[model samples]
Target chain A: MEIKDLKRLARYNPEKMAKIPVFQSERMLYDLYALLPGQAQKVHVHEGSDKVYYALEGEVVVRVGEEEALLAPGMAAFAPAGAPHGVRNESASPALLLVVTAPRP
Target chain B: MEIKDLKRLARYNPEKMAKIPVFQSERMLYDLYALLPGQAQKVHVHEGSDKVYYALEGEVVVRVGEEEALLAPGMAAFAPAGAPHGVRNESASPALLLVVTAPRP
Candidate 1:
Protein backbone atom coordinates (compact mmCIF):
# COMPACT_ATOMS: atom_id res chain seq x y z
CA MET A 1 0.00 0.00 0.00
CA GLU A 2 1.24 3.47 -0.87
CA ILE A 3 0.32 5.00 2.41
CA LYS A 4 1.09 8.43 3.84
CA ASP A 5 0.56 9.68 7.33
CA LEU A 6 -0.85 13.18 7.11
CA LYS A 7 0.05 13.91 10.69
CA ARG A 8 3.66 13.12 10.00
CA LEU A 9 4.00 14.41 6.45
CA ALA A 10 2.05 17.61 6.73
CA ARG A 11 3.55 20.91 7.80
CA TYR A 12 1.17 23.60 8.84
CA ASN A 13 1.68 27.00 7.21
CA PRO A 14 0.38 29.91 9.13
CA GLU A 15 0.18 32.24 6.17
CA LYS A 16 -2.27 30.12 4.23
CA MET A 17 -3.91 26.75 4.07
CA ALA A 18 -1.46 23.90 3.69
CA LYS A 19 -2.33 21.09 1.33
CA ILE A 20 -0.78 17.64 1.36
CA PRO A 21 -1.47 15.43 -1.62
CA VAL A 22 -2.57 12.05 -0.41
CA PHE A 23 -3.33 10.27 -3.66
CA GLN A 24 -3.88 11.03 -7.31
CA SER A 25 -4.80 9.26 -10.52
CA GLU A 26 -5.97 10.23 -13.98
CA ARG A 27 -9.53 10.56 -12.78
CA MET A 28 -9.23 11.86 -9.25
CA LEU A 29 -7.18 13.56 -6.56
CA TYR A 30 -7.28 13.08 -2.83
CA ASP A 31 -5.70 15.63 -0.53
CA LEU A 32 -5.45 16.73 3.04
CA TYR A 33 -5.49 20.34 4.14
CA ALA A 34 -4.40 21.83 7.42
CA LEU A 35 -6.02 25.14 8.11
CA LEU A 36 -4.94 27.33 10.94
CA PRO A 37 -7.55 29.31 12.74
CA GLY A 38 -8.54 32.48 10.81
CA GLN A 39 -7.15 31.18 7.56
CA ALA A 40 -9.31 30.15 4.63
CA GLN A 41 -9.28 28.60 1.22
CA LYS A 42 -11.19 31.23 -0.64
CA VAL A 43 -14.37 30.46 -2.52
CA HIS A 44 -13.82 28.82 -5.83
CA VAL A 45 -15.36 26.40 -8.31
CA HIS A 46 -13.84 23.15 -9.50
CA GLU A 47 -14.98 23.74 -13.08
CA GLY A 48 -15.82 20.31 -14.48
CA SER A 49 -14.98 18.45 -11.32
CA ASP A 50 -17.00 17.74 -8.24
CA LYS A 51 -15.59 18.34 -4.77
CA VAL A 52 -16.02 16.56 -1.49
CA TYR A 53 -14.84 17.51 1.97
CA TYR A 54 -14.61 15.52 5.18
CA ALA A 55 -13.71 17.08 8.50
CA LEU A 56 -11.05 14.95 10.06
CA GLU A 57 -10.50 16.93 13.24
CA GLY A 58 -11.01 20.29 14.93
CA GLU A 59 -13.64 22.55 13.40
CA VAL A 60 -14.28 24.08 10.02
CA VAL A 61 -16.77 26.39 8.40
CA VAL A 62 -17.56 25.26 4.88
CA ARG A 63 -19.53 27.06 2.26
CA VAL A 64 -21.22 26.02 -0.96
CA GLY A 65 -22.57 29.06 -2.79
CA GLU A 66 -24.79 30.91 -0.35
CA GLU A 67 -24.99 28.08 2.11
CA GLU A 68 -22.67 27.69 5.05
CA ALA A 69 -22.04 24.80 7.37
CA LEU A 70 -20.13 24.21 10.54
CA LEU A 71 -18.32 20.93 10.15
CA ALA A 72 -17.06 18.84 13.01
CA PRO A 73 -15.29 15.52 12.99
CA GLY A 74 -17.25 12.94 11.00
CA MET A 75 -19.07 15.60 9.01
CA ALA A 76 -18.89 16.00 5.25
CA ALA A 77 -19.94 18.42 2.55
CA PHE A 78 -20.31 18.25 -1.20
CA ALA A 79 -20.07 20.71 -4.05
CA PRO A 80 -21.15 19.93 -7.58
CA ALA A 81 -19.23 20.97 -10.63
CA GLY A 82 -19.23 24.74 -11.12
CA ALA A 83 -20.58 25.28 -7.64
CA PRO A 84 -18.69 27.73 -5.51
CA HIS A 85 -17.26 26.27 -2.35
CA GLY A 86 -14.78 27.27 0.31
CA VAL A 87 -13.55 26.44 3.78
CA ARG A 88 -12.39 28.36 6.84
CA ASN A 89 -10.98 27.29 10.15
CA GLU A 90 -12.60 29.25 12.91
CA SER A 91 -11.74 27.20 15.94
CA ALA A 92 -8.61 27.78 17.94
CA SER A 93 -7.37 24.31 17.20
CA PRO A 94 -5.87 23.38 13.87
CA ALA A 95 -8.48 22.15 11.44
CA LEU A 96 -7.72 19.20 9.27
CA LEU A 97 -9.85 17.93 6.41
CA LEU A 98 -9.74 15.32 3.73
CA VAL A 99 -10.64 16.79 0.37
CA VAL A 100 -11.34 14.93 -2.83
CA THR A 101 -11.83 16.14 -6.35
CA ALA A 102 -12.86 14.17 -9.43
CA PRO A 103 -11.26 14.34 -12.88
CA ARG A 104 -7.91 15.39 -11.49
CA PRO A 105 -8.43 18.98 -10.59
CA MET B 1 -23.45 23.22 1.48
CA GLU B 2 -24.97 19.79 1.22
CA ILE B 3 -23.76 18.77 4.62
CA LYS B 4 -24.04 15.29 6.04
CA ASP B 5 -23.11 14.21 9.51
CA LEU B 6 -21.83 10.72 8.87
CA LYS B 7 -21.94 9.64 12.48
CA ARG B 8 -25.62 10.53 12.51
CA LEU B 9 -26.47 9.19 9.05
CA ALA B 10 -24.72 5.89 9.54
CA ARG B 11 -25.97 2.83 11.32
CA TYR B 12 -23.32 0.27 12.18
CA ASN B 13 -24.19 -3.22 11.06
CA PRO B 14 -22.46 -5.87 13.07
CA GLU B 15 -23.17 -8.38 10.31
CA LYS B 16 -20.76 -6.52 8.01
CA MET B 17 -18.74 -3.32 7.60
CA ALA B 18 -21.14 -0.44 7.25
CA LYS B 19 -20.83 1.63 4.12
CA ILE B 20 -22.35 5.09 4.17
CA PRO B 21 -22.50 7.30 1.12
CA VAL B 22 -21.21 10.74 1.97
CA PHE B 23 -21.26 12.23 -1.50
CA GLN B 24 -21.54 11.11 -5.10
CA SER B 25 -21.31 12.63 -8.54
CA GLU B 26 -20.90 11.28 -12.03
CA ARG B 27 -17.14 11.50 -11.69
CA MET B 28 -16.65 10.20 -8.17
CA LEU B 29 -18.12 8.64 -5.08
CA TYR B 30 -17.18 9.40 -1.47
CA ASP B 31 -18.17 7.07 1.29
CA LEU B 32 -17.46 6.08 4.86
CA TYR B 33 -17.01 2.57 6.20
CA ALA B 34 -17.12 1.38 9.76
CA LEU B 35 -15.49 -1.98 10.27
CA LEU B 36 -15.69 -3.73 13.56
CA PRO B 37 -12.60 -5.56 14.73
CA GLY B 38 -11.99 -8.78 12.78
CA GLN B 39 -13.94 -7.50 9.76
CA ALA B 40 -12.28 -7.12 6.44
CA GLN B 41 -13.08 -5.91 2.97
CA LYS B 42 -11.57 -8.67 0.93
CA VAL B 43 -8.95 -7.92 -1.67
CA HIS B 44 -10.34 -6.44 -4.88
CA VAL B 45 -9.46 -4.12 -7.72
CA HIS B 46 -11.26 -1.11 -9.16
CA GLU B 47 -10.59 -2.12 -12.76
CA GLY B 48 -10.52 1.20 -14.62
CA SER B 49 -10.55 3.49 -11.59
CA ASP B 50 -8.46 4.16 -8.53
CA LYS B 51 -9.50 3.90 -4.92
CA VAL B 52 -8.40 5.99 -1.96
CA TYR B 53 -8.80 5.14 1.69
CA TYR B 54 -8.25 7.41 4.69
CA ALA B 55 -8.25 6.11 8.22
CA LEU B 56 -10.45 8.21 10.46
CA GLU B 57 -10.46 6.25 13.68
CA GLY B 58 -9.05 3.19 15.39
CA GLU B 59 -6.70 1.09 13.30
CA VAL B 60 -6.65 -0.61 9.92
CA VAL B 61 -4.43 -3.00 8.05
CA VAL B 62 -4.32 -2.12 4.36
CA ARG B 63 -2.84 -4.10 1.52
CA VAL B 64 -2.00 -2.99 -1.98
CA GLY B 65 -0.30 -5.44 -4.23
CA GLU B 66 1.89 -7.48 -1.88
CA GLU B 67 2.57 -4.56 0.42
CA GLU B 68 0.74 -4.24 3.70
CA ALA B 69 0.45 -1.16 5.86
CA LEU B 70 -0.87 -0.51 9.31
CA LEU B 71 -2.93 2.64 9.23
CA ALA B 72 -3.84 4.90 12.11
CA PRO B 73 -5.99 7.99 12.11
CA GLY B 74 -4.64 10.57 9.64
CA MET B 75 -3.16 7.89 7.44
CA ALA B 76 -4.10 7.41 3.78
CA ALA B 77 -3.57 4.71 1.21
CA PHE B 78 -3.92 4.51 -2.54
CA ALA B 79 -4.74 1.62 -4.82
CA PRO B 80 -4.20 2.37 -8.45
CA ALA B 81 -6.41 1.14 -11.23
CA GLY B 82 -6.36 -2.64 -11.42
CA ALA B 83 -4.30 -2.88 -8.24
CA PRO B 84 -5.66 -5.30 -5.73
CA HIS B 85 -6.25 -3.86 -2.29
CA GLY B 86 -8.06 -4.68 0.91
CA VAL B 87 -8.53 -3.47 4.47
CA ARG B 88 -9.06 -5.11 7.81
CA ASN B 89 -9.64 -3.89 11.32
CA GLU B 90 -7.55 -6.07 13.57
CA SER B 91 -7.66 -3.91 16.67
CA ALA B 92 -10.17 -4.62 19.37
CA SER B 93 -11.75 -1.21 18.88
CA PRO B 94 -13.85 -0.17 15.90
CA ALA B 95 -12.25 1.30 12.81
CA LEU B 96 -13.64 4.05 10.62
CA LEU B 97 -12.36 5.11 7.23
CA LEU B 98 -13.30 7.33 4.34
CA VAL B 99 -13.24 5.67 0.95
CA VAL B 100 -13.20 7.36 -2.44
CA THR B 101 -13.52 5.98 -5.94
CA ALA B 102 -13.21 7.88 -9.16
CA PRO B 103 -15.47 7.65 -12.20
CA ARG B 104 -18.29 6.32 -10.10
CA PRO B 105 -18.69 2.57 -9.69
Candidate 2:
Protein backbone atom coordinates (compact mmCIF):
# COMPACT_ATOMS: atom_id res chain seq x y z
CA MET A 1 0.00 0.00 0.00
CA GLU A 2 1.56 3.24 -1.16
CA ILE A 3 -0.36 5.85 0.78
CA LYS A 4 0.41 9.44 1.63
CA ASP A 5 -0.93 12.63 3.13
CA LEU A 6 -0.18 15.00 0.30
CA LYS A 7 -0.69 18.20 2.23
CA ARG A 8 2.12 17.24 4.56
CA LEU A 9 4.45 16.72 1.61
CA ALA A 10 3.95 20.04 -0.08
CA ARG A 11 7.06 22.10 -0.69
CA TYR A 12 7.77 25.48 -2.26
CA ASN A 13 10.70 27.44 -3.62
CA PRO A 14 11.14 31.08 -4.46
CA GLU A 15 12.94 30.50 -7.77
CA LYS A 16 10.36 28.25 -9.39
CA MET A 17 7.37 26.01 -8.75
CA ALA A 18 8.19 23.00 -6.61
CA LYS A 19 6.96 19.69 -7.95
CA ILE A 20 6.59 17.25 -5.06
CA PRO A 21 6.09 13.65 -6.11
CA VAL A 22 3.22 11.79 -4.52
CA PHE A 23 3.32 8.58 -6.53
CA GLN A 24 4.32 7.18 -9.90
CA SER A 25 3.69 4.01 -11.80
CA GLU A 26 4.56 2.84 -15.27
CA ARG A 27 1.46 4.54 -16.60
CA MET A 28 1.03 7.68 -14.54
CA LEU A 29 2.73 10.34 -12.45
CA TYR A 30 1.05 12.04 -9.49
CA ASP A 31 2.54 15.15 -8.00
CA LEU A 32 1.88 18.34 -6.09
CA TYR A 33 2.98 21.66 -7.49
CA ALA A 34 3.62 24.41 -4.96
CA LEU A 35 4.22 27.87 -6.30
CA LEU A 36 5.02 31.16 -4.67
CA PRO A 37 3.75 34.37 -6.13
CA GLY A 38 5.30 35.06 -9.56
CA GLN A 39 6.41 31.43 -9.99
CA ALA A 40 5.34 29.61 -13.14
CA GLN A 41 5.84 26.62 -15.36
CA LYS A 42 6.46 27.78 -18.89
CA VAL A 43 4.08 26.52 -21.58
CA HIS A 44 5.08 23.13 -22.91
CA VAL A 45 3.66 20.15 -24.74
CA HIS A 46 3.74 16.42 -24.24
CA GLU A 47 3.51 14.33 -27.37
CA GLY A 48 1.41 11.53 -25.88
CA SER A 49 0.66 12.15 -22.22
CA ASP A 50 -2.42 13.88 -20.94
CA LYS A 51 -2.44 15.95 -17.76
CA VAL A 52 -4.83 17.40 -15.19
CA TYR A 53 -4.33 20.16 -12.65
CA TYR A 54 -6.56 20.47 -9.62
CA ALA A 55 -6.28 23.52 -7.45
CA LEU A 56 -5.67 22.76 -3.79
CA GLU A 57 -4.92 26.19 -2.27
CA GLY A 58 -4.85 29.84 -3.21
CA GLU A 59 -5.16 30.83 -6.86
CA VAL A 60 -3.49 29.79 -10.05
CA VAL A 61 -3.78 30.77 -13.68
CA VAL A 62 -3.94 27.67 -15.84
CA ARG A 63 -3.51 27.72 -19.58
CA VAL A 64 -4.65 24.88 -21.73
CA GLY A 65 -4.54 25.29 -25.46
CA GLU A 66 -5.81 28.78 -26.32
CA GLU A 67 -7.80 29.28 -23.15
CA GLU A 68 -6.78 30.27 -19.64
CA ALA A 69 -8.57 30.70 -16.35
CA LEU A 70 -7.96 31.48 -12.70
CA LEU A 71 -8.65 28.44 -10.57
CA ALA A 72 -9.56 28.56 -6.90
CA PRO A 73 -9.47 25.57 -4.64
CA GLY A 74 -11.61 22.69 -5.92
CA MET A 75 -11.30 23.79 -9.54
CA ALA A 76 -9.54 21.70 -12.16
CA ALA A 77 -8.40 21.88 -15.75
CA PHE A 78 -7.56 19.23 -18.29
CA ALA A 79 -4.79 19.49 -20.82
CA PRO A 80 -5.16 16.82 -23.41
CA ALA A 81 -2.15 15.32 -25.11
CA GLY A 82 -0.37 17.63 -27.56
CA ALA A 83 -1.98 20.82 -26.33
CA PRO A 84 0.32 23.44 -24.93
CA HIS A 85 -0.32 24.00 -21.24
CA GLY A 86 1.21 25.56 -18.15
CA VAL A 87 0.41 27.25 -14.86
CA ARG A 88 1.46 30.22 -12.74
CA ASN A 89 0.80 31.80 -9.37
CA GLU A 90 0.23 35.48 -10.09
CA SER A 91 -1.69 36.33 -6.93
CA ALA A 92 -0.21 37.64 -3.70
CA SER A 93 -0.64 34.26 -2.01
CA PRO A 94 1.03 30.97 -2.79
CA ALA A 95 -0.76 28.27 -4.74
CA LEU A 96 -0.84 24.51 -4.43
CA LEU A 97 -2.12 22.09 -7.03
CA LEU A 98 -2.53 18.38 -7.46
CA VAL A 99 -1.26 17.33 -10.86
CA VAL A 100 -1.50 14.03 -12.64
CA THR A 101 0.02 13.07 -15.97
CA ALA A 102 -0.72 9.82 -17.70
CA PRO A 103 1.32 7.52 -20.02
CA ARG A 104 4.56 9.00 -18.68
CA PRO A 105 5.30 10.79 -21.97
CA MET B 1 -9.98 24.33 -22.26
CA GLU B 2 -11.77 21.53 -20.53
CA ILE B 3 -12.08 22.95 -17.05
CA LYS B 4 -14.31 22.15 -14.09
CA ASP B 5 -15.10 22.93 -10.50
CA LEU B 6 -15.12 19.40 -9.13
CA LYS B 7 -16.52 20.22 -5.71
CA ARG B 8 -19.61 21.69 -7.35
CA LEU B 9 -20.10 18.60 -9.50
CA ALA B 10 -20.25 16.06 -6.71
CA ARG B 11 -23.44 14.06 -6.38
CA TYR B 12 -24.47 11.42 -3.88
CA ASN B 13 -26.90 8.52 -3.88
CA PRO B 14 -28.34 6.69 -0.92
CA GLU B 15 -28.40 3.40 -2.85
CA LYS B 16 -24.80 3.42 -4.01
CA MET B 17 -21.74 5.54 -4.57
CA ALA B 18 -22.16 8.13 -7.26
CA LYS B 19 -19.34 8.26 -9.77
CA ILE B 20 -19.16 11.64 -11.48
CA PRO B 21 -17.03 12.08 -14.56
CA VAL B 22 -14.52 14.91 -14.49
CA PHE B 23 -12.41 14.27 -17.57
CA GLN B 24 -11.13 11.50 -19.81
CA SER B 25 -8.54 10.98 -22.50
CA GLU B 26 -7.00 8.07 -24.36
CA ARG B 27 -4.71 7.40 -21.43
CA MET B 28 -6.61 8.44 -18.33
CA LEU B 29 -10.01 8.63 -16.64
CA TYR B 30 -10.65 11.26 -13.96
CA ASP B 31 -13.71 10.94 -11.80
CA LEU B 32 -15.24 11.86 -8.45
CA TYR B 33 -16.86 9.23 -6.23
CA ALA B 34 -19.40 10.40 -3.69
CA LEU B 35 -20.33 7.86 -1.07
CA LEU B 36 -22.89 8.22 1.66
CA PRO B 37 -22.46 6.33 4.89
CA GLY B 38 -22.70 2.56 4.48
CA GLN B 39 -22.01 2.74 0.75
CA ALA B 40 -19.08 0.99 -0.86
CA GLN B 41 -17.41 -0.17 -4.03
CA LYS B 42 -16.79 -3.87 -3.95
CA VAL B 43 -13.20 -5.03 -4.21
CA HIS B 44 -12.10 -5.47 -7.80
CA VAL B 45 -8.98 -5.88 -9.83
CA HIS B 46 -7.77 -4.18 -13.01
CA GLU B 47 -5.20 -6.16 -14.89
CA GLY B 48 -3.60 -3.42 -16.94
CA SER B 49 -4.38 -0.08 -15.37
CA ASP B 50 -3.07 1.69 -12.30
CA LYS B 51 -5.46 3.65 -10.15
CA VAL B 52 -5.24 6.34 -7.49
CA TYR B 53 -7.79 7.26 -4.82
CA TYR B 54 -7.52 10.70 -3.34
CA ALA B 55 -9.58 11.67 -0.33
CA LEU B 56 -11.47 14.90 -0.87
CA GLU B 57 -13.88 15.09 2.11
CA GLY B 58 -14.97 13.19 5.21
CA GLU B 59 -13.56 9.80 6.06
CA VAL B 60 -13.19 6.77 3.83
CA VAL B 61 -11.85 3.29 4.50
CA VAL B 62 -9.66 2.43 1.55
CA ARG B 63 -8.28 -0.99 0.85
CA VAL B 64 -5.45 -1.78 -1.52
CA GLY B 65 -4.37 -5.37 -1.50
CA GLU B 66 -3.62 -6.36 2.13
CA GLU B 67 -3.60 -2.87 3.53
CA GLU B 68 -6.58 -0.85 4.71
CA ALA B 69 -6.62 2.61 6.17
CA LEU B 70 -8.94 5.46 6.93
CA LEU B 71 -8.28 8.48 4.78
CA ALA B 72 -9.22 12.07 5.43
CA PRO B 73 -8.86 15.05 3.16
CA GLY B 74 -5.46 15.34 1.42
CA MET B 75 -4.74 11.64 1.80
CA ALA B 76 -4.23 9.34 -1.19
CA ALA B 77 -3.63 5.72 -2.01
CA PHE B 78 -2.34 3.90 -5.04
CA ALA B 79 -3.60 0.59 -6.36
CA PRO B 80 -1.15 -0.64 -8.91
CA ALA B 81 -2.04 -2.81 -11.88
CA GLY B 82 -3.23 -6.28 -10.81
CA ALA B 83 -3.93 -5.26 -7.25
CA PRO B 84 -7.29 -5.63 -5.57
CA HIS B 85 -8.81 -2.41 -4.26
CA GLY B 86 -12.01 -0.80 -3.02
CA VAL B 87 -13.39 1.93 -0.77
CA ARG B 88 -16.23 2.51 1.64
CA ASN B 89 -17.66 5.33 3.66
CA GLU B 90 -18.32 3.84 7.08
CA SER B 91 -18.32 7.10 8.96
CA ALA B 92 -21.52 8.97 9.74
CA SER B 93 -20.78 11.62 7.16
CA PRO B 94 -20.58 11.43 3.40
CA ALA B 95 -17.25 10.88 1.71
CA LEU B 96 -15.88 12.34 -1.50
CA LEU B 97 -12.92 11.01 -3.44
CA LEU B 98 -11.04 11.88 -6.56
CA VAL B 99 -10.22 8.75 -8.51
CA VAL B 100 -7.97 8.37 -11.51
CA THR B 101 -7.11 5.39 -13.63
CA ALA B 102 -4.28 5.32 -16.14
CA PRO B 103 -3.98 3.75 -19.60
CA ARG B 104 -7.76 3.36 -19.67
CA PRO B 105 -7.92 -0.36 -19.06
Candidate 3:
Protein backbone atom coordinates (compact mmCIF):
# COMPACT_ATOMS: atom_id res chain seq x y z
CA MET A 1 0.00 0.00 0.00
CA GLU A 2 2.96 2.33 -0.42
CA ILE A 3 1.80 5.24 -2.59
CA LYS A 4 5.18 6.77 -3.36
CA ASP A 5 6.52 4.00 -5.51
CA LEU A 6 5.22 5.33 -8.81
CA LYS A 7 7.41 6.99 -11.42
CA ARG A 8 6.89 10.55 -12.56
CA LEU A 9 7.82 12.35 -15.71
CA ALA A 10 10.65 14.83 -15.61
CA ARG A 11 9.94 18.42 -14.69
CA TYR A 12 9.10 20.73 -17.59
CA ASN A 13 9.92 24.33 -18.36
CA PRO A 14 7.09 26.84 -18.27
CA GLU A 15 8.92 29.95 -19.54
CA LYS A 16 8.27 28.71 -23.04
CA MET A 17 5.02 26.90 -23.68
CA ALA A 18 5.85 23.24 -23.14
CA LYS A 19 3.25 20.51 -23.22
CA ILE A 20 4.02 17.93 -20.56
CA PRO A 21 1.84 15.06 -21.53
CA VAL A 22 0.41 13.22 -18.57
CA PHE A 23 -1.71 10.76 -20.46
CA GLN A 24 -2.79 10.35 -24.05
CA SER A 25 -5.30 7.90 -25.31
CA GLU A 26 -7.33 7.82 -28.52
CA ARG A 27 -9.88 10.10 -26.94
CA MET A 28 -7.99 12.53 -24.68
CA LEU A 29 -4.78 14.21 -23.51
CA TYR A 30 -3.95 15.73 -20.14
CA ASP A 31 -1.24 18.35 -19.65
CA LEU A 32 0.23 20.67 -17.04
CA TYR A 33 1.40 24.17 -17.90
CA ALA A 34 3.59 26.27 -15.63
CA LEU A 35 2.88 29.79 -16.69
CA LEU A 36 5.07 32.69 -15.62
CA PRO A 37 3.65 36.08 -14.77
CA GLY A 38 2.72 38.53 -17.51
CA GLN A 39 3.21 35.79 -20.04
CA ALA A 40 0.66 35.13 -22.72
CA GLN A 41 0.21 32.29 -25.15
CA LYS A 42 -0.54 32.55 -28.83
CA VAL A 43 -4.16 32.35 -29.78
CA HIS A 44 -5.00 28.93 -31.10
CA VAL A 45 -7.96 26.67 -31.67
CA HIS A 46 -8.33 22.95 -31.22
CA GLU A 47 -10.32 21.94 -34.21
CA GLY A 48 -11.20 18.51 -32.86
CA SER A 49 -10.64 18.74 -29.16
CA ASP A 50 -12.59 20.47 -26.45
CA LYS A 51 -10.36 22.29 -23.96
CA VAL A 52 -10.68 22.79 -20.22
CA TYR A 53 -8.39 25.08 -18.29
CA TYR A 54 -8.16 24.44 -14.56
CA ALA A 55 -6.44 27.22 -12.69
CA LEU A 56 -4.30 25.76 -9.91
CA GLU A 57 -2.58 28.96 -8.84
CA GLY A 58 -2.68 32.72 -9.45
CA GLU A 59 -5.16 34.68 -11.54
CA VAL A 60 -5.61 34.28 -15.27
CA VAL A 61 -7.50 36.04 -18.01
CA VAL A 62 -8.87 33.60 -20.56
CA ARG A 63 -10.05 34.69 -23.98
CA VAL A 64 -12.33 32.82 -26.28
CA GLY A 65 -12.97 34.71 -29.45
CA GLU A 66 -14.96 37.78 -28.38
CA GLU A 67 -15.81 36.45 -24.93
CA GLU A 68 -13.34 36.67 -22.06
CA ALA A 69 -13.24 36.09 -18.35
CA LEU A 70 -10.89 36.47 -15.41
CA LEU A 71 -10.27 33.35 -13.32
CA ALA A 72 -8.59 33.08 -9.99
CA PRO A 73 -7.14 30.05 -8.24
CA GLY A 74 -9.54 27.10 -8.09
CA MET A 75 -11.56 28.41 -11.02
CA ALA A 76 -11.85 26.65 -14.37
CA ALA A 77 -13.18 27.50 -17.82
CA PHE A 78 -14.33 25.36 -20.70
CA ALA A 79 -14.04 26.07 -24.42
CA PRO A 80 -15.66 23.82 -26.92
CA ALA A 81 -13.66 22.45 -29.81
CA GLY A 82 -13.21 24.71 -32.84
CA ALA A 83 -13.30 27.77 -30.63
CA PRO A 84 -10.33 30.14 -30.85
CA HIS A 85 -8.93 30.87 -27.43
CA GLY A 86 -5.84 31.75 -25.39
CA VAL A 87 -4.74 32.67 -21.88
CA ARG A 88 -2.55 35.21 -20.07
CA ASN A 89 -1.27 35.84 -16.58
CA GLU A 90 -2.61 39.20 -15.35
CA SER A 91 -0.75 39.18 -12.05
CA ALA A 92 2.89 39.67 -11.00
CA SER A 93 3.72 36.10 -9.98
CA PRO A 94 3.79 32.53 -11.28
CA ALA A 95 0.74 30.42 -12.03
CA LEU A 96 0.05 26.74 -12.57
CA LEU A 97 -2.61 25.66 -15.03
CA LEU A 98 -3.97 22.26 -15.91
CA VAL A 99 -5.32 21.63 -19.39
CA VAL A 100 -7.45 18.65 -20.25
CA THR A 101 -8.63 17.91 -23.75
CA ALA A 102 -10.81 15.30 -25.32
CA PRO A 103 -9.65 13.64 -28.59
CA ARG A 104 -5.93 13.92 -28.08
CA PRO A 105 -4.19 16.38 -30.40
CA MET B 1 1.62 39.59 -21.00
CA GLU B 2 3.70 37.83 -18.40
CA ILE B 3 2.15 34.43 -17.73
CA LYS B 4 3.90 33.91 -14.38
CA ASP B 5 2.00 36.45 -12.33
CA LEU B 6 0.34 34.41 -9.58
CA LYS B 7 1.00 33.01 -6.12
CA ARG B 8 1.09 29.33 -5.25
CA LEU B 9 0.44 27.53 -2.02
CA ALA B 10 3.48 26.05 -0.34
CA ARG B 11 4.62 22.55 -1.16
CA TYR B 12 3.13 19.85 1.05
CA ASN B 13 4.53 16.56 2.24
CA PRO B 14 3.27 13.43 0.62
CA GLU B 15 4.44 11.03 3.28
CA LYS B 16 1.99 12.63 5.64
CA MET B 17 -1.52 13.00 4.37
CA ALA B 18 -1.92 16.72 3.88
CA LYS B 19 -5.06 18.10 2.33
CA ILE B 20 -4.02 20.89 -0.04
CA PRO B 21 -7.19 22.75 -0.71
CA VAL B 22 -7.29 23.93 -4.30
CA PHE B 23 -10.84 25.23 -4.26
CA GLN B 24 -13.68 24.87 -1.81
CA SER B 25 -17.10 26.26 -2.42
CA GLU B 26 -20.49 25.22 -1.11
CA ARG B 27 -20.61 22.55 -3.81
CA MET B 28 -17.10 21.18 -4.35
CA LEU B 29 -13.55 20.72 -3.11
CA TYR B 30 -10.50 20.16 -5.33
CA ASP B 31 -7.34 18.68 -3.87
CA LEU B 32 -3.96 17.24 -4.87
CA TYR B 33 -2.49 14.31 -3.01
CA ALA B 34 1.04 12.95 -3.39
CA LEU B 35 0.71 9.29 -2.54
CA LEU B 36 3.61 7.03 -1.75
CA PRO B 37 3.50 3.40 -2.81
CA GLY B 38 1.96 0.85 -0.46
CA GLN B 39 0.08 3.59 1.34
CA ALA B 40 -3.65 3.29 1.71
CA GLN B 41 -6.20 5.65 3.16
CA LYS B 42 -8.81 4.86 5.76
CA VAL B 43 -12.22 3.89 4.52
CA HIS B 44 -14.39 6.97 4.66
CA VAL B 45 -17.70 8.08 3.25
CA HIS B 46 -18.60 11.51 1.99
CA GLU B 47 -22.32 11.88 2.56
CA GLY B 48 -22.75 14.78 0.16
CA SER B 49 -19.82 14.75 -2.26
CA ASP B 50 -19.05 12.77 -5.35
CA LYS B 51 -15.38 11.76 -5.41
CA VAL B 52 -13.28 11.49 -8.49
CA TYR B 53 -9.78 10.06 -8.33
CA TYR B 54 -7.56 11.04 -11.22
CA ALA B 55 -4.44 8.95 -11.33
CA LEU B 56 -1.51 11.01 -12.54
CA GLU B 57 1.15 8.32 -12.31
CA GLY B 58 1.55 4.64 -11.42
CA GLU B 59 -1.29 2.24 -10.79
CA VAL B 60 -3.88 2.46 -8.06
CA VAL B 61 -6.34 -0.05 -6.65
CA VAL B 62 -9.55 1.71 -5.69
CA ARG B 63 -12.13 0.07 -3.54
CA VAL B 64 -15.70 1.27 -3.39
CA GLY B 65 -17.70 -1.04 -1.18
CA GLU B 66 -17.88 -4.34 -3.10
CA GLU B 67 -16.72 -3.04 -6.48
CA GLU B 68 -13.06 -2.24 -7.07
CA ALA B 69 -10.86 -1.32 -10.00
CA LEU B 70 -7.25 -0.80 -10.96
CA LEU B 71 -6.53 2.55 -12.54
CA ALA B 72 -3.34 3.62 -14.27
CA PRO B 73 -2.02 6.94 -15.42
CA GLY B 74 -4.51 9.17 -17.20
CA MET B 75 -7.36 7.05 -15.93
CA ALA B 76 -9.96 8.21 -13.42
CA ALA B 77 -12.55 6.62 -11.18
CA PHE B 78 -15.74 8.12 -9.89
CA ALA B 79 -17.35 7.18 -6.57
CA PRO B 80 -20.62 8.59 -5.50
CA ALA B 81 -20.92 10.20 -2.13
CA GLY B 82 -21.79 7.92 0.83
CA ALA B 83 -19.96 5.02 -0.82
CA PRO B 84 -17.39 3.62 1.56
CA HIS B 85 -14.18 3.64 -0.43
CA GLY B 86 -10.40 3.76 -0.29
CA VAL B 87 -7.27 3.54 -2.48
CA ARG B 88 -3.92 1.77 -2.42
CA ASN B 89 -0.88 1.96 -4.63
CA GLU B 90 -0.14 -1.51 -5.96
CA SER B 91 3.11 -0.51 -7.63
CA ALA B 92 6.52 -0.06 -6.07
CA SER B 93 6.97 3.56 -7.13
CA PRO B 94 5.52 6.87 -6.05
CA ALA B 95 2.17 7.94 -7.45
CA LEU B 96 0.43 11.26 -7.82
CA LEU B 97 -3.33 11.41 -7.46
CA LEU B 98 -5.74 14.28 -7.93
CA VAL B 99 -8.98 14.13 -6.01
CA VAL B 100 -11.93 16.32 -6.94
CA THR B 101 -14.91 16.19 -4.66
CA ALA B 102 -18.18 17.96 -5.29
CA PRO B 103 -19.77 19.52 -2.21
CA ARG B 104 -17.22 20.66 0.30
CA PRO B 105 -16.25 17.99 2.91
Winner by lDDT: 2
Ranking of candidates on DockQ, top first: 2, 1, 3
lDDT of 2 by residue, A1-105 (tens): 899998788888878899998997888888899989999878989889999999988889999999999878999899999999999899999898999999886
The per-model lDDT (C-alpha) reads: 0.83, 0.90, 0.59
Which residue pairs collide in model 2, if any?
A: none
Error in Å for residue B29 of model 2: 1.0
Q: Estimate each model's TM-score.
A: 0.90, 0.97, 0.49
Q: Which order, best to worst by TM-score?
A: 2, 1, 3
Per-residue alpha-carbon lDDT of candidate 2 for residues B1-105, written as tens digits (9 for 90 to 100): 889999788999988899998996788889999999999888899989999999998879999998899878889999999999999899999999999999887
Error of 3 at A23 (Å): 1.9
DockQ-wise, the better of 1 and 3 is 1
Which candidate should be chosen as best, given TM-score against the real structure?
A: 2
Off by over 4 Å in 1: none
Model 1 over residues B12-78: C-alpha lDDT tens digits? 6789888878776788878778889888889887798888878877788998888889978878888
Per-chain TM-score of chain A in candidate 2 equals 0.96
In the range A1-105, model 3's lDDT, one tens digit per residue, is 211211233243556644555443333455556667767666789886666666655667887667778766655666666778787877787665666565455
